[PDB]
Ligand binder design. Sequence first.
Ligand SMILES: NC[C@@H]1O[C@H](O[C@H]2[C@@H](O)[C@H](O[C@@H]3[C@@H](O)[C@H](N)C[C@H](N)[C@H]3O[C@H]3O[C@H](CO)[C@@H](O)[C@H](O)[C@H]3N)O[C@@H]2CO)[C@H](N)[C@@H](O)[C@@H]1O
Ligand SMILES: [Mg+2]
Ligand SMILES: [Mg+2]
Ligand SMILES: [Mg+2]
Ligand SMILES: [Mg+2]
Ligand SMILES: [Mg+2]
Ligand SMILES: [Mg+2]
Ligand SMILES: [Mg+2]
Lengths: 134, 402, 65
Amino acid sequence: ANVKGCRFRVSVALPVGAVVNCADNTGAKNLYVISVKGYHGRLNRLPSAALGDMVMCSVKKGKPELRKKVLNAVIIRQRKSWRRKDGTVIYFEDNAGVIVNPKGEMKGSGIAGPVAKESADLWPKISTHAPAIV
Amino acid sequence: SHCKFEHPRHGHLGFLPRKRSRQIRGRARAFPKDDATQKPHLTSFMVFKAGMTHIVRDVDRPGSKVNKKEVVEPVTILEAPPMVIVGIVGYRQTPVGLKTIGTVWAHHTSVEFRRRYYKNWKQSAQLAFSRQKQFANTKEGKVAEARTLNAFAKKASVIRVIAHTQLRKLRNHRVGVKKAHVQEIQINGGNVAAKIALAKSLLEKEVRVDSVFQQSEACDVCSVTKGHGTEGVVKRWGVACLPRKTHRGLRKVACIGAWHPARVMYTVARAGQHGYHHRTQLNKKIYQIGRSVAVEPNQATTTYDLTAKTITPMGGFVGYGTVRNDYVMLKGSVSGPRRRVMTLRRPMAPQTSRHLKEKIVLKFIDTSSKIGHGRFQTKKEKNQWFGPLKKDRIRREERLRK
Amino acid sequence: MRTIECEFSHFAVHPGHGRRYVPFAFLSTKPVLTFSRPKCFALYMRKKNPRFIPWTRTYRRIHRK
RNA sequence: CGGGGAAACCCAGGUGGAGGCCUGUAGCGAUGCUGACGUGCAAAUCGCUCGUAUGAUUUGGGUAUCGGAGCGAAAGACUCA
RNA sequence: AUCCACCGGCCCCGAAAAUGGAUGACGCU
RNA sequence: AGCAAAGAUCUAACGGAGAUAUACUCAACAUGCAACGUUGGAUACUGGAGCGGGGAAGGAUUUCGUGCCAACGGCACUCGU
RNA sequence: UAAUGAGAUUCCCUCUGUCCCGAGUUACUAUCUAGCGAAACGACAGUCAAGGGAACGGACUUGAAGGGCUAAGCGGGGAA
RNA sequence: CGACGUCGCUUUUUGAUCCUUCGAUGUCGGCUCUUCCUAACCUAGCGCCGCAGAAGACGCUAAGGGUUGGAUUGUUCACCCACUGACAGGGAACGUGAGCUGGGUUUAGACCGUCGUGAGACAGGUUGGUUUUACCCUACUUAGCUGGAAAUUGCGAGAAAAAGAUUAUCCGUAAGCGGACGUGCGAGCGGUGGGUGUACGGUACGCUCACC
RNA sequence: UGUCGAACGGCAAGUGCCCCGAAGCCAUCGCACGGUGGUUCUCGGCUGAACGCCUCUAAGCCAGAAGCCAAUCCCAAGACCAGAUGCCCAC
RNA sequence: UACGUCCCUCUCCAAACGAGAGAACAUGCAUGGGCUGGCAUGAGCGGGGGGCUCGUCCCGAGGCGCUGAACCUUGAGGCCUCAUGCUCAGGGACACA
Ligand SMILES: NC[C@@H]1O[C@H](O[C@H]2[C@@H](O)[C@H](O[C@@H]3[C@@H](O)[C@H](N)C[C@H](N)[C@H]3O[C@H]3O[C@H](CO)[C@@H](O)[C@H](O)[C@H]3N)O[C@@H]2CO)[C@H](N)[C@@H](O)[C@@H]1O
Ligand SMILES: [Mg+2]
Ligand SMILES: [Mg+2]
Ligand SMILES: [Mg+2]
Ligand SMILES: [Mg+2]
Ligand SMILES: [Mg+2]
Ligand SMILES: [Mg+2]
Ligand SMILES: [Mg+2]
């Protein structure tokens, strides 16, 4: 009940099972999409994520201080091409996420690469620490 | 025993029977509700589909994330030669229905109008509307015209006129039909005495599309879907495809019913005709009522884009040709292939939502090629990327040799 | 809008036509790279120079003029 | 043939071509698809995949052992569907 | 002319299931 | 229902009853289609663990020439074991 | 218990249409024609709702449908 | 909310029975797909609270719509992880094997434990173990052709109709009232004929043949 | 890789393989659209007695659910349409 | 008797087959030209690691030039009348006891 009807429709990229990068410097190196917040159910359909979506994750490779637990990440990059409303189709080289709180605070201090305009606008802690808002 | 999990069922069950359309043309099954406080005006117009393209426009939508920002919207181009009125019918209310009183005719009908009465026009006597033409100006026939015009004023609640597409001004090579498409357009507005005077005045006179619609409104598009033959259950209804190790096949519905009721139901999805269906598709926002190339050599030119260019792309609309007449440009898609006649009808939905009141100004119309990837907007831009090529330097060698 | 030009071939990318792309090693000046074709993005992936391909604008401005 | 050692003997480079050794044709089998076919091409076949392929190996002709009996690396298997 | 305790007749409530449905049907007040 | 593995046939001239087959006032297409053998030519295939050339077992005239087309060669035949 | 296993099981890596979630192309069929030409099956036949009944009717009772004849499908019934 | 009692509904459990089937109704669960029911989990209106708000208890009218992704298990069930507005409960021969799958029960091989002198046994565990046929009738899906109101015939005459319904031109309303070619020769409303420009290219509008 | 002597043009490998590829088809993998009136249930009421006051109910009214019925939407005269019409014939 | 309809012929908005949309001397069809797109610089000819021969002349993958050349572009069916070819009283059957 936080972010769903706030940004436009984006082509979903990362279903449950996906293993994305951690651009956050929380010591982790890896996420694993466990589910997606905002998934109203459809039979046989997986929870899939897009740029602005908060996911439920677990670190599969990183510090054991936060590895075997269910965390909250926010997607910032995806390889799946999404069409913006100004008619431009755009995509990243890699998928990445950044771990957050249940309320959205970034839990680290810096992002590796860029972030999108789609995920920075929903999350002001993500738009602050990002070196380039794509 | 109950189904173990729930999904919503496949396909809307109100578009049954999914059989071929009875006729290829869009036909309104209902016109808008007659407001007798309005001015008498026509309510539908036949246009032909001529490919589609996209535009750029800035958005006036306060509150939105795209407020005063430019979007790219796809639009469909629909060529509209004017239709010529040839008749006036009038309908009277009965407890059975709505019965036709009669029709007056125009005293002068087109060759392509009375071509619609012949399966073979060129190998015929061609003498249709030939005894009605000569009886209409006898003493007794001028009476009988005014006899049934008065019977409209007595009994009719619904006045309609009969138009036809006028295909010889549609100078199109691929729409191969030469007989005209005939429909009835309902007059709405005023009382019945005010409808007939508008039905008499535009009789044997062509009506143009910008006299029926405005530039930034919406409409309904009665049109017949693109046909796809006999398709199976996965293409037609959208059912889930079975696991790979299934014997006798994947693209089937596994259970078509219980033991009891010992019959297959109409709700169970089966195979058969997919496509070539009539659809009405309300709230198609109109963006540009165009004007003929004999009037406008610069059709796609905007205030904000001063490139002198027409609506027809480079290398033409694919499979269609050139838009040679007036045209309407609608937001999005309309049901049907190119070359198919389609009926733009005034809306029955309340046109009061703030998405539908929005006035449209464009900024760019894509006139690039639809063959391949479009790269140049005009041919003037391809002659500046490419300089003089080889075939140009030997045509310039023949022009100096003379 | 505006006509972006392609990164590889410097073609004309009019609105609603190309396909934009942004890599992990992003430039500060060109974070997002606009491409006009998949053929332009394919010769960008195998790391060909825009010159030495005879149909790009880089070639045509150093050899033929 | 070289090297180390007081000796016992060790260490290295080749040579050699051992094995119910290995990959893999033919041959001999028949794992999976629970594939195709299932009024078949076929009263058991087709396809790909698979087991083995110097041995307790495969095979022709000839001979010898049978009906409460024969033969059996044993499945009551086989003894002219 | 107004209250109180009891008892009866018809009617209602109590009275919720999986194909569309049955005083045999229409209907009847 | 079917006659769907083993890529594939095309061409012209001859042969043959198997054609180029028409009641008028019709130039031909729109009123004789399909199919056969042989030689030439084109195109392929098998690919020397061969739709190559010889033998055993088994068959016993299927060999060869000439005629010939009733029935057989699950379509066809002017061809044929 | 090393080596060996068309043996039984579990996890990880790579990997992918197994899946999300389907789409599109090919050869051969189906399909249409020419030639040829079967079988299984077959009491009679063949639209349903309820009632009753050997207590799950195509035939009986009362209702509801049903103009005739076809081509391709299809697997709910014929307790096929 | 409600003991002690008590009156009942339900046939998604199980027991009891033995009516039907042993010249055979394919005997589990998934998967798929459609529909039904209400004893309402979410959604639409509500009443009522030990209802201040926020969350929520109980109830009513309502089954229109929705009711998931997973780990383990062959599982129905169970149990946790997570999303959600919510993850309601059931029926249809314990819906659905010429729809699939074959994990499991439910043969022949083999192993183990307990039993048996043994052959063998085991609502004990384990492993390996052919899923055949539609071209018929109907149903359903689409795709063609074609008669028929005495639903094929009777000639068996019923118009959501006109108003002489008794003779007869129309127009417009009942009281009124507009005009209607005159006698083979004429004329009038008209369909088609020859030459120098008008309305939104070629059709109309200016100035020999039928009918009155 | 083989093969027409080599280049040329090709061809064989049941489409040799690799890259780009029109058109067509197609993806919640893109894009566009998805609307009106009433009836009346629960219920809260209005007038108002039976029952000299009281009372939503007994007559009578009001407002009113995602239900229900229409509009829109899809098929549509075996719904047998003296609905209208064009041209021939026949009366 | 006529109006006509249907087959054969042509087209593809339709299509398993029928049915449908159309056209039937028509830029209708055929080929060409131009456009539009696709690929990426054709055969041919002429001026570089090295290596032969007796400064010169030959062998040499690659490169460069003519050359955004060459080819392909509607066809289950892109565009333009931009040019020319082809049609020469369309044929059969019903309507019709
Ligand atoms: N009878 C002749 C003798 O050969 C001798 O020659 C021998 C030695 O020089 C030398 O002997 C070596 C030596 O390096 C060292 N000190 C000791 C070593 N064991 C010997 O090694 C010898 O024996 C070993 C076996 O162990 C062999 O593998 C090898 O063939 C050989 N090199 O290798 C030669 C043997 O092949 C001497 N010349 C001398 O004693 C005498 O002449
Ligand atoms: Mg089509
Ligand atoms: Mg081996
Ligand atoms: Mg045994
Ligand atoms: Mg065949
Ligand atoms: Mg070969
Ligand atoms: Mg034969
Ligand atoms: Mg072994």
